[PDB]
């Protein structure tokens, strides 16, 4: 039961179901205590059963319990566990992650097979803690907090922080991912190259593997944090390290479109 | 029906009323039982609705007040050909009612909304998914407080152990609570004046060290 922005209250359906259960239970105890006839007690017990049922699995037997002035079934425990929206699939086998971003992909040819264009601002927010530590190591900020406050406003940013950010990401890689991810090449590792502008630059040869084109596709970026994660991404997941399809065995990264045309 | 309670619930509460009636009935008055029973049934049902309808429980008298406010505002909207203001409802409610009171009464009658109310027309999204958690400390907050304790210890190490311990006991960094001058004085075996003077010189040396190094400024927000 939480007070939201405007000062109003928002609550789960489980509270309503539990309320129903508690009410019918208490009324049953009082009915018994006053020695009500059998029909009344039987009815009360039946209602108690249906209450427990609605609490555990709603809609399983009979009409699904709803809120007043709503046709929307209350969300029970069973509904919380199972389903595509269920606990397992929604919050367990997949999760939303920190140190991630997304933007519009745009081609560039200049990139080496192992590289990708990464917008400066995106890089700043993604690598932000490393940028703080590096800004502290250098003379740009007295400490961490001062650095963070310095990054808070856009007009408080100077060029030293950008060069420092270059020193941060050196040798490091990021993961690029395009949905839907149909196979393990839907996620690939690249060394970022910081670029002005808001678009992520993608290498032409990996387009086929990602099934990505330039009609307005968007990609997501992730930053492996630990030295272990980085080792994994650089050895195993690096774009230039997977040249062949794990499925057929034929080269996945190969000339296409304009390249084939010219040759 | 439709008052916030299920049909069967109303039936059971009405049954409780019926039982009260059976116990309180007097056949000597020659009345039919239905007449006397109806009163206790209505009473039981209304008590039930007033009690159990709202997720956040409102005392029966306050409920009655809120309802009177409803019927009042509805009468006013039916006569004026538009929704009334707070001031008009305040007028129509008689003496002792102002705009502020009506506003607060409406504020206190607000029912909560479901976290599961779907947003977007689809099976995809829930309202509760868009509501941040203001309770648990963000990683930035944890980092900030940690760096704060570490920096305060770095600053307290530049003192002697006695005066630093005096400051830690007086601000409660040790056991979690702030000791009085007499307790710290009795712990170090000195007069309260003495321990207060030690606290003062410690605070002074800290203020000097702070003016010099400018280290603890950023944490002051």
């Amino acid at each position: 039961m939480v007070q939201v922005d405007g000062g109003r209250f928002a609550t789960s359906d489980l509270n309503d179901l539990y309320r129903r259960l508690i009410n019918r239970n208490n009324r049953l105890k009082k009915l018994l205590a006053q020695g009500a006839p059998e029909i009344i007690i039987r009815n009360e017990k039946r209602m108690l059963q249906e209450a427990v049922d609605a609490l555990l699995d709603n809609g399983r037997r009979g009409a699904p319990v709803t809120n007043p002035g709503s046709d929307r079934p209350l969300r029970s425990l069973t509904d919380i566990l199972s389903g595509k929206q269920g606990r397992f699939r929604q919050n367990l086998l997949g999760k939303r992650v920190d140190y991630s971003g997304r933007s519009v992909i745009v081609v560039g040819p200049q990139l080496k097979l192992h590289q990708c264009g990464l917008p400066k601002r995106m890089a700043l927010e993604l690598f932000k803690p490393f940028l703080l530590k590096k800004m502290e190591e250098k003379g740009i900020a007295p400490n961490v907090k001062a650095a963070r406050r310095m990054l808070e406003r856009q007009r408080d940013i100077k060029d030293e922080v950008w060069d420092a950010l270059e020193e941060v990401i050196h040798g490091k890689v990021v993961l690029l991912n395009r949905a839907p991810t149909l196979h393990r090449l839907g996620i690939q590792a690249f060394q970022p190259v910081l670029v002005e502008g808001q678009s992520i630059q993608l290498h032409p040869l990996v387009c086929e593997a990602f099934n990505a084109d330039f009609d307005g596709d968007q990609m997501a970026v992730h930053v492996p944090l630990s030295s272990f994660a980085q080792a994994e991404a650089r050895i195993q997941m690096l774009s230039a390290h997977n040249l062949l399809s794990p499925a057929s065995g034929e080269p996945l990264a190969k000339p296409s479109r304009d390249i084939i045309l010219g040759l | 029906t439709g008052r916030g309670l299920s049909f069967l619930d109303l039936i059971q509460e009405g049954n409780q009323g019926l039982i009260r009636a059976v116990e309180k009935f007097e056949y000597k008055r020659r009345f039919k039982f239905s007449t006397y029973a109806t009163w206790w049934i209505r009473q039981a049902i209304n008590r039930a609705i007033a009690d159990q309808a709202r997720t956040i429980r409102i005392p029966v008298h306050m409920v009655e007040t809120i309802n009177k406010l409803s019927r009042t505002a509805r009468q006013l909207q039916q006569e004026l050909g538009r929704e009334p203001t707070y001031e008009e409802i305040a007028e129509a409610m008689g003496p002792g009612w102002d705009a502020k009171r009506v506003e607060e009464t409406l504020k206190i009658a607000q029912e909560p909304v479901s976290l599961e109310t779907p947003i977007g027309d689809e099976k995809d999204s829930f309202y509760g998914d868009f509501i941040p958690d203001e309770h648990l400390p963000s990683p930035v907050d944890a980092a900030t407080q940690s760096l704060l304790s570490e920096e305060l210890e770095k600053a307290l190490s530049k003192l002697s152990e006695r005066e630093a311990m005096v400051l830690k006991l007086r601000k409660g960094l040790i056991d979690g609570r702030e000791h009085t001058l007499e307790e710290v004085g009795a712990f170090f075996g000195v007069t309260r004046e003495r321990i207060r003077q030690i606290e003062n010189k410690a605070l002074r040396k800290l203020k000097y060290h702070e003016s010099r190094t400018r280290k603890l400024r950023d944490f002051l927000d």
Partner: peptide, 14 residues
């Protein structure tokens, strides 16, 4: 199946 109906019927027996 429908609790209301069942209870109305139980009531009707008296």
């Amino acid at each position: 199946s429908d609790p209301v109906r069942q209870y109305l019927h139980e009531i009707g027996q008296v």
